[PDB]
Each structure stands twice: as C-alpha cells, then as structure tokens.
Amino acid sequence: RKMERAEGPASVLAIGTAVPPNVVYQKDYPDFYFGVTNSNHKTELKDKFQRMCDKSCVSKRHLYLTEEILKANPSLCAYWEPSLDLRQDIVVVEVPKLGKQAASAAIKEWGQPKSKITHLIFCTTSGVDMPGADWALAKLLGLRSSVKRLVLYMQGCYGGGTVLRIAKDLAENNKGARVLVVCSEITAITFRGPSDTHLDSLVGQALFGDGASALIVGSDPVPAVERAWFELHWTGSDILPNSDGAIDGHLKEVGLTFHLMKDVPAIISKNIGGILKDALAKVFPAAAPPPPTYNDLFWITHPGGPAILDQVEDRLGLRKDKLASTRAVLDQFGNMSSATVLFIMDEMRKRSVEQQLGTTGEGHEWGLLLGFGPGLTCETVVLRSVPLV
Amino acid sequence: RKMERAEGPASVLAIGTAVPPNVVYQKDYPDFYFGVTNSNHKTELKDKFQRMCDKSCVSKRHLYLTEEILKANPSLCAYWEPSLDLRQDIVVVEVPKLGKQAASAAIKEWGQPKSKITHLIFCTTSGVDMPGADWALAKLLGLRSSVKRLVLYMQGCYGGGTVLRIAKDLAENNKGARVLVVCSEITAITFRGPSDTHLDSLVGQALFGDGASALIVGSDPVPAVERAWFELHWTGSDILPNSDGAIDGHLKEVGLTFHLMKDVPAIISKNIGGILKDALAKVFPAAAPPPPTYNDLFWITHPGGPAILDQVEDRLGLRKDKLASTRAVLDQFGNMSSATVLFIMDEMRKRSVEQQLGTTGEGHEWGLLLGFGPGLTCETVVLRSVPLV
Ligand SMILES: O=C1C[C@@H](c2ccccc2)Oc2cc(O)cc(O)c21
Ligand SMILES: O=C1C[C@@H](c2ccccc2)Oc2cc(O)cc(O)c21
Q1: B230-384 has which CATH code?
Q2: Residue contact A170–B170, C-beta within 8 A
Q3: Distance of CA B376 to CAs A92, B126, B184, B242, B244, Å?
C-alpha cells in the first residue's frame, strides 16, 4: 500500500561525459564556417563574426557535423531552407547514442550492475520523437524494461539544473532508487548558414558545441561500496523580471531557430544576487550558521557566454578564481546547453582530486550550480561537496 | 541546509477540465472529414472509414479546428504537405490557453489562492517551443515567478500516468508543495487528409479529440480546508515485450505523423494481467490483506480504442460495468491522449458523488489508473479512493 522513501540527501554517485570525435578549433572556425556555407563574399558579416570568435573565450568545440557531412547535405549549409526532417533523422539517433557513451562511463565508474538503475531522466534541446530519446537510450543500454523514464525535450541552457531538481525528488522519495540522468546535445538541430540580420544565430555559431553528460543520483549511498561526490540540498527556479522574450527558441520547418531580444547578461547579473541571497537565507536561516561568503562557495555556473560570466562575476564581486572551473569547460567545449553544468561539475571534482584539495568542491563545503535559459529562467541548486581522503 | 518533506500520500485536491466549443458528432464526421478534405471521390477509402466510425464507440468529440479554420488554411486539409509552422503557430498558443481553462476550474474548486501553487507539470503531445507551454500557462495564470515548472513534450497516450508518477514525488518530498498538473491536447498537430496507405492516420481521424484537464496534487491536505479525492500510493512503468515499433509518432515538416506497426490491443491485453498482478502484489504483500479482486477495484483506464478496452476486459475477465466510466469519456470526447485518464477520474468522482456511492471510486477503496502509449509503454498507478459523507 506504500512505497518506502529514502532518508539521506540525493547524492551524485558517478559522472560520465562524451563528445563527438571531430574537434574544431576556434582559430579555424570562421574560415571553416564561412567556407562550408558558400559565404566568404559576405566580407562584412564575416569579420564581425571573426570578432566574436575572438572574444568568445572558447578555444575548441567537439561537433558531430563534419565538413563531409555538411558536404553531403546541402540544406544545412544553406540558410533558412527546409531542413527539419533531415536534422531530426540525424539527431533522434545521434543524441541518444552520444548519451549512451556518457551513461556507460558513469555506470562503469559507479561500479554497480546497470539493472540497479530504477529511473532515467533524459534531457535534450536537440530533436523530438515518440518513443523518445529516453526510450532509445534505455534500448541502447539494455536497462530493465520497468525503469521509470522521463524525457525533457526543448529545455535549453537551464536544463542541467532542471534534471537535478527532479532527480532530487525521485532519489529522495524512493528507497533504493538510482536515477540515471543524461543531458545530450548535438548542434545539427540549429546549424545554419550566416546572414546579416540573423545575428542572434551568429552568436550561436560562435559558442554552441556538442556533448553529453550522465549522472547516477541516489540517496543513502551504500557505505564502502558507492561513493558520493556532491549532495543536492536545496533547489529553486525563477523567472527573471523584465525578461519576456529574452531567449526564444522555435522548432521550425527550417530547423531550430534561436533568438535574443534582450541584453541577457544585464538581466542575469542584475537579478542573480537577490536570488542567491534568498536561496542561502533559506539554506542557512537565522532562528546558527551565517551563510558562507560567495568566495567561500564553489561555483558550477552555466557559461552561456563570456559576457554573462564577466558581469555575474562583477556584480557579485566574486574573486577572479571562482569561475575558473566554469571557464575551463567553456574554453574546451563551448556552450553545450543543458549538459554544460555537468561537464563543469565533473571538471571541478577531478581537479579537486588531482590537486588533493580538501573536498570535491575545490576545498569548499557548499556550492551553487546555476542554469540559465528561456524564460528568462534561472535554476538554482545549492550543493554540498564531500570531503576527500 | 534542507527542504522539509511532506508526510502523507500525494492526493488529488481538485480537478478541472476544458474542451473547445466546437462539437463534431461521429454520425456527421465521415461527411465533414471527407467533405473538408476534397476527397469524396475516394469512395473506397471513404467507406471503410465509415465502418471504423461505426465501431469507434465515440459519439462526439470537441475540436478546435473549424470548417472555417480549415477553409482558411488549405495545407492541413491537404495531405502530406508542409504544415508544421502553421500548426505550431496554432498549437503553441491554443494548447496553453485550453490548459489555462482547466487550470482555473481546478483552482477555483480547490479554493486556495493561485499563489499557493509551488510546482507546475504541463504535459502535451501537441506542439513544442521554448519557452514552453509550462511557461506560457504560468504567464496566462499569473503564477508566482518562482513556481518550479516542468514541461513534458511528445509524451503520447501514457502521459496521464506519467504526470501522476512525477507529481507524487514532488508533492510527497516537499512540505507544503501544491502541484498544478495540466494535460492539454489539440488535434491540429496531426490533422491530415485521408489516403489509402495512411490507414494508421485513418484510425487517428476516428478517435482523436481535443481537451485539457488540470489537477491540484498535494500531500497532507489541510483538514476541513482542502479536500482529497484520490490518493497516489504506488506507481510503475513498463515497456511491454515484443512491442518495438508498435506505436510511433514523428514530428515532421508535414506535421505530427502517427504509426501503428503492431496489433496494439493484443500486446496490451496479453501482458496487462502480469503487470497488474505484480503491482498489486507489491501494494498488498504477504509477510495481511489479500489484494482485492479486479471487480472490487475502480478502473481509470486510458481508452486508446474500443478494441483495447474490449480485449483487456476479456483477458482479465472484468465484469462489464468496471470500464463504464472509462467508456463514457471515450464516447463523449474520444481519445484525448494524455488528458483522457483525468477526464475519466473526474467523471468517476462526479458520478460517485451524484449517486451517493460510498467512495470517490464508485464505492471501492482501491483502483488502477492505466496509460498506454509509444514504447509500448504502460504506466500503472495504484490509487486509493476517499470515502464520501
Ligand atoms: O537554439 C538552441 C541551441 C541549443 C543547442 C545547443 C547546442 C547543441 C544543441 C542544441 O541550445 C539552446 C539553448 C537555449 O537556452 C536556447 C536555444 O534556442 C538553444
Ligand atoms: O499522433 C499523435 C496524436 C496525439 C494527439 C491526440 C489528440 C490531440 C493531440 C494530439 O496523440 C498521440 C498519442 C500517441 O500515443 C501517439 C501519437 O502519434 C499521438
């Protein structure tokens, strides 16, 4: 008559990542991009893109689309021409396949048999289908036929916080539950040619890359058997003021299109302080601890772009090293939408181990994961690190 | 450092429904359908459709598409011609608007101010967008900017069980949480003309209707203030054996397309017994109660079609009155995909009140809600009724 619930906080027990093999260096991208799109006569357009690549703080990105793949399918190299069936027929298979790579890495690391996975959350902004990427991934992995699945489509760059917000309740309210969390994104859904009044779509071409990340999330890790890396303690979601239409994304016959109608860095950086301050007030209330200072937290922040990071760092007065893990991931894979915060989480724990810092969170006990996306939606997750050795 | 959890079982505290005003009687539909599609010369095709309307056990359905709306947009009356941008530009506004109708009915009934809603789950098979129908609905309703939202897109006919499975954990693991659950479906996403090798799409034209349903789901109802109607006690999800490709749905440039590659009624009815028997074994284990007989449970079953209902009823040996509430909803609105089980739940409690039966579940204590869809996915929710007067 009942389902027993768990007792301890939803914990990240393993993380895996995966990227397409093809690497595109940002030094090379304005040439590759304008070359493969038959558009170098667009000398004016070409050079402000050159300038945004220069200021993108992305060094390289992994992309599924090859010179040869774009060679063979002209309608993506073209611009604003019917393309949805071709991208979907790519993305509906390549997105779950990339996610299966990350998932196998997480499961191996976790060390338990794949049949102990009781739930799956699959999150993507690239492609839609029925049955969905969740079912395609379960088929690829051979999960038990009764895993409870959830596919979160058309999320955007806040989706990495969204999957943690949901996984927390699945893990905490079901005794023994082990949640596979996968975020997988592939840029074939939005890749277009350049144009001189699609300069929203231009910024996309400078920052968006491909990748997938996977977590195992569970409460009450089996002692000496399973290993927790971060604990999910508090979540919050917010629609920022005066941000209507800031970030829109439409799934159209020409594919997925991308729109910025507001100064997204100003909106986030102006309002982020009040959000964090309230969240920490809830986690550390007077009635007891004072909340740690911003510099004494670890920061897992979605790098929508350099201008967001710089203005957040400026408005909150963060010491210049706090966004280091965030910036390293953007530099080496660019903006991978919902998957990005989980690459950052993985990078942060790996350095902490490698450099023998005191905790999985760079030596700090508490931290914040932030996702931003259409809405303008901001997802806040207060995390706790776990001590090392 | 914490989020308090709730103590009692996630309970349905209110239900509202809504349908487009335009009513189409099944007696009239083969003429209306073939008339508005320029296809009555298709005398052969026309008459087996006549036959499936005859055997559809649907009397009427509410549809957003009018004779005049189809008059004004020829590409939907046509068949298999570019149509996705037009349907989406319809559905991305009409689906949240229909859902806002049902939501306001649920909230009024609930009686608490709309700002006490802390979470939203919006489920639909009709349209996708960013920001999503969840955000569009929150905007229409004026919910607090910090409601935690979740949009479940491209679910299909099992989605009504899916939203309960998720809402259960949100309500139960967050003290004070009140979840708005909305399922909204509008058939403009799939409406096509007829063809003589699109006879999957033909069955769709006989059974699919429009509608939206909304729930308020919360744990620990405030005594004498809030009223519970059903309690969610156990959930389970299953991919039925040998059902690969049974039910596929693709979002294409011509719109959303619908495919049956297996005998869906045989697959469900052959395997449903083992699922129910296992579920009840878990809810009522020996260690104590024996599980109630099938005839002593109330049944809230998704009416994919008459052939599913009849073979389930036959293979499980259910007395002929058990699927009565289910069949009444299919008769008066047809298959409304994810919303249908919640119309049935609403119909069942309303009769129980009207006829002064002992419980919200027709006088029975325990019941089953079943959703079926692509996968072949079966969602099982063991519910408990609440006693009346
Ligand atoms: O336009 C899309 C692009 C998409 C993506 C990026 C990388 C790989 C696949 C897909 O991410 C987004 C995030 C948003 O917050 C808004 C968007 O409109 C998009
Ligand atoms: O083809 C769609 C139709 C959709 C619907 C019905 C009514 C109103 C809007 C949308 O419901 C479905 C359920 C499925 O299990 C599989 C499907 O392929 C569909």
Answers
A1: 3.40.47.10
A2: no
A3: 18, 19, 22, 9, 7
